[PDB]
Symmetry: C3
Subunit: 508 residues, 3 copies
């Protein structure tokens, strides 16, 4: 801001050419200004979604922004209604053989001895019976002649009878003591097989109890477990089905947000145009009176050229002016000067310009070439040549534009990144559930149930007897009759001398 620049040199003494109107021609202008606008309501639902029903249902939850934006576009406080609705969701036998061999005679001399008794085997053969029965008879023959015991021959018969009865006795005694052994040991064995089958019955019973209980346990587990999976199934379905819903909504809400902005852009443009319409209405107030009620002394304002008269008329959202004016039909370039500094005495005009007919300056009217003479009534004089310099920099407003960081730097201010563990369950396939094989033992049991059959005793039929071999009381006197035959020969030997008469016949 200097009070001066140079000496006798400035734009203020530029002295250059400039067009001045010389002749004129009648003119008119039609000038149009808008003063009002068609503020119309906008349906956000029609603007953002249009006809996309999977959006129409969601945009509703965003709120009454639609009203806020319409309150802006249209200067009408919409008198909305009131609604109270809220959703709510709730033995000796061999030894006798070995010693006697095949000599039937050695029979009695081979008699063995068990304990305090003499024994023989119980079998007489045609050789032995010949020996003893002819010995018995010979002892009965000799005794009739011999003075004493011709019956010394009968000892072997009477003894071999006694010894054999003893042999039978010792052999029956053991047959019986064997019978007591086989009876006791079979009684003891069936006592132990009775225990065995009580124990097998108890073992089979216990197995049956558990195998059945555990079958029940598997059934119960299967009933519950197959229900549990049915429950897991239903629950995972609800989740997947809702996750899918969320994956539709979380996409659709992003496009809606973009359109919400795109709508806020349309709204902002309308307000910006509304401020220009209302500035054009403020301009129409000056423009209408400075010509209609008055006459403007300006240029190009309210009608191109120099304003004279005006006739206004209306339009649907505006005013139209049929202004009247005059314009240069003919105009000429003249060397002119804002000021002229004479010997340190700056000189300028009053209500006009300096213009130069070649020989000297005149003052003239800026907008009509009519030279006038220079005088104090027509000019100003200043004792200082120096030219004052001003500066006027019309800075239209510089907004404090937003100052966003990188997105990462704002994100990490509050964003919690996340990664849940890769969860897994415990493998049950380590369960072996071993099977059983007893088919060897079951086939073996069948084998012995078949083979026990062979052991079924099949003795050699002996026979009991003791049937009807009885004599009758009516005939029992049969032997008494024999005694009567002894009486009959008692007459024949009434004396023995008849035998002596037969011995006399043996002599003769």
């Amino acid at each position: 801001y200097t009070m001066s620049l140079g000496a006798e040199n400035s734009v203020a003494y530029s002295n250059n050419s400039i067009a001045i109107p010389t002749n004129f021609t009648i003119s008119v202008t039609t000038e149009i200004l808008p003063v009002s606008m068609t503020k119309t309501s906008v349906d956000c639902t029609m603007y953002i979604c249009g006809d996309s029903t999977e959006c129409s249902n969601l945009l509703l939850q965003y709120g009454s922004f639609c009203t806020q934006l319409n309150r802006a576009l249209t200067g009408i406080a919409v008198e909305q209604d009131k609604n109270t609705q809220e959703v709510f969701a709730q033995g000796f036998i061999k030894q006798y053989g070995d010693c006697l061999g095949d000599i039937a005679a050695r029979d009695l001399i081979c008699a063995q001895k068990f304990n305090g008794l003499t024994v023989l085997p119980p079998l007489l053969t045609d050789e032995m019976i010949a020996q003893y029965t002819s010995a018995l008879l010979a002892g009965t023959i000799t005794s009739g002649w011999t003075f004493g015991a011709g019956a010394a021959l009968q000892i072997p018969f009477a003894m071999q009878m006694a010894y054999r009865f003893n042999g039978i006795g010792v052999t029956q005694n053991v047959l019986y003591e064997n019978q007591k052994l086989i009876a006791n040991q079979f009684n003891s064995a069936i006592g132990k097989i009775q225990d065995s089958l009580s124990s097998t019955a108890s073992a089979l019973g216990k197995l049956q109890d558990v195998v059945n209980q555990n079958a029940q346990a598997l059934n119960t587990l299967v009933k519950q477990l197959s229900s549990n999976f049915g429950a897991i199934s239903s629950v995972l379905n609800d989740i997947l089905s809702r996750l899918d819903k969320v994956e539709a909504e979380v996409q659709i809400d992003r496009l809606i947000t973009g359109r919400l902005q795109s709508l806020q852009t349309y709204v902002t443009q309308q307000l910006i145009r509304a401020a220009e319409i209302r500035a054009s209405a403020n301009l129409a107030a000056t423009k209408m009176s400075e010509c209609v009620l008055g006459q403007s002394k300006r240029v190009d304002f309210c009608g191109k050229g120099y304003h004279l008269m005006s006739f206004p008329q209306s339009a649907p959202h505006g005013v139209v002016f049929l202004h009247v004016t005059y314009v240069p039909a003919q105009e000429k370039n003249f060397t002119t000067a804002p000021a002229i500094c004479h010997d340190g005495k700056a000189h300028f005009p009053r209500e006009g310009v300096f213009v130069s007919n070649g020989t000297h300056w005149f003052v003239t009217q800026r907008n009509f070439y009519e030279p006038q003479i220079i005088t104090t009534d027509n000019t100003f004089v200043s004792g200082n040549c120096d030219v004052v310099i001003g500066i006027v920099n019309n800075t239209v407003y510089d907004p404090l534009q937003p100052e966003l960081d990188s997105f990462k730097e704002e994100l990490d201010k509050y964003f919690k990144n996340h990664t849940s563990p890769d969860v897994d369950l415990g493998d049950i396939s380590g369960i072996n559930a071993s099977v059983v094989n007893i088919q060897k033992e079951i086939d073996r049991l069948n084998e012995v149930a078949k083979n026990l059959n062979e052991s079924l005793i099949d003795l050699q039929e002996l026979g009991k007897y003791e049937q009807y071999i009885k004599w009758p009381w009516y005939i029992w006197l049969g032997f008494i009759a024999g005694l009567i035959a002894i009486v009959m020969v008692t007459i024949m030997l009434c004396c023995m001398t008849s035998c002596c008469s037969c011995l006399k016949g043996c002599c003769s």
Copy 2:
């Protein structure tokens, strides 16, 4: 844009009535302009959420938009602080009977034969003993008289004794061979029952091994599986809970977004009003000087009325002017003309209007009725009658309004639809887990354990008896005394002639 319209006919030549001020009255106006604007700040959290704590937290994640919007409302780049905080999350017997029967004494003639020996049954009856013992005795009687073998009668006694001993021999031999058979077959049977019970023990043992191993396997599976169902129970619960968080947040963020816009509307309105306040401050600069430092030549500027003087008074956020003016006390309608075309020579005024006192035109001052005479110093003259036509259509800016498609057409540009399969698990209820039934066999086994009792052998007591039957050595000479009695009768028969004397008595 025509250089002409018609001949002697235009809005420029048509003369009509206009209101010219005739008398005046002193006036003032108070004119107010707001030059300043207290741009107050705004708390987004209070604006969007207010007091809804389930929202206050969400706004933090949105970012510092609140600052960006306040930098717009205000004009000072708020000097915010710096914070470095980041969350982080990590036998013969029958045949002897059949042939004998009960006839006399066929006993010996009925003797049978096994192998090379003759046999009889071992039973003598009072009938048979009478036959044989009286036969034996009769053979001892006859032999005393008969010259030879009267003992032919003794053959049947001596033979039947021998045959019976044989019968007893053949019947003992088999009684022994039956005894060996019974012993062997019982020894073989207990050999097979020993195998059977070794097998049964092996079968029961291995069954016990598996049933008990499989019980362990069920326990182990139940321990793991019941833990496993506990794990999914905990994991589903997280999924469910975290989704409750999502389904709340994904709803609440939609209403927040609507308010974010509703806030961007408030902010936009403020900037729009800020631009009008700053345009009103630009208008106050012209209005203040054109009337304070100077005097305006306009009719309605600085308040309706011809401005004369001004006195400004500062206001907190505006400026108040007490302007001084004059207004038409009396005004009159006059037929006036912008121009008048005389014989092809268009004619208009200088710094005024044409006005018509009935007989002829005058020039006058537009805003005061003072008629003046027409002259070149007071008017302009043209050569051409033709009227030039201009058009000035003040189009306030038409913005490039947004050009959104249907929502569907923008959605399908990037939207993915995702329907996951209706997942299901495999039904385990095809597991039958059969049960076991051994009752019949366990019952049968306890019934044979009861019934084996009947087989306990109960033999018929026989008796041994081989003890007190021993003669003493002190008395054994008892039979030697008998031999001494034989010596005593040896004197009585010292000769036999004493028996002859008794036979002589039998004669007499």
Copy 3:
């Protein structure tokens, strides 16, 4: 709006000092106006996300909002291309003893009786054999002398033989009947043990079938269940993995939305500045002609000072005026009045101010001190003193500021709160899966498998022996030779008188 205020007292009259220019000085001003604004294209992706790739992808779904905002900033309907791309996702024995005691003599008199037969025990002792064999022999001695039955002595031998054979018969018969009993009861017992082992085999077979069937059932369940837990593992992994994704996106979209606004703020500021540039271009149209094509009669307009001439030049995005003017170098305070009411006749000036040299008023030019005399050609006169009052309150537009409720009250209009049940599965640990204990019975069965080993009968060896004691046919005549020895003594007793000669020797 009053037509009057007071009498002889108003701001229109109250006079006071004012600064009128007295001397002047040549001046210039440089005045700058912008008339154009660079409409640059802004990349939303660079503005919102910058370089954060986990955001760049999301902006795609946000749709063509970037174009809508650029259409606003840059008034150019960008001719975008067309793309058709859509993603798609598809016995008697004792009794004989008790009675006979120790008397070989009581032998026969102690014979017992079973049924219809007499019995003795089958054992002869050296005492009994002495009795009977010496009785037998004595009966053969006596019978040679006695007239009749000296053989009465032989009854006891012949009877005791018969009775003992019976004793042996009754004792063989019962031994045979014991043998049948044991055979039958062993045959019946092995018949019942055969049943038992058929039943044990059936029981073991049925326990093998099920235990092995249930092992298969456990295997099948384990195969399916371990697959089923694998399927769950995979499905819960999807849910979680995709939920994590949603928890990233639902956070990141909130910061994006905040920047979307922060961007809509930048865009709004640009439009606001664009409206001021275009208002500055509208101001440049008046400013350029009122000073270039003409000369303004206003104050401070076209730079400080009274405008005289102008020289315009271009600017980067505006216009620069080198205006020429004059300014007060020297100015003086003067007591001046807009109007002066003389005796009810209000009086004001024409095209100037009243100024007061001490003695009286003058009219003068507002912007130059040159006193002039008061006259009707230089002033206006009114009839009424009364001062008219106007008011002009320039209300810059008051917008319909948004009218948001509390957030809760808008939220509850459509927000559905949701709390799913705390789902749980049914506890399977109530499954007992009882084990089995059979050891006692298996050890008992192995102990009997060893116990019966003793019951193996070990009879007392008896012996058969029906071997070779046979006589040869070549020697059988041995006893016939005995008959020849009987013939040899038949000569010695050819008569008995030789025995009589020996009895005569017994006499002598």
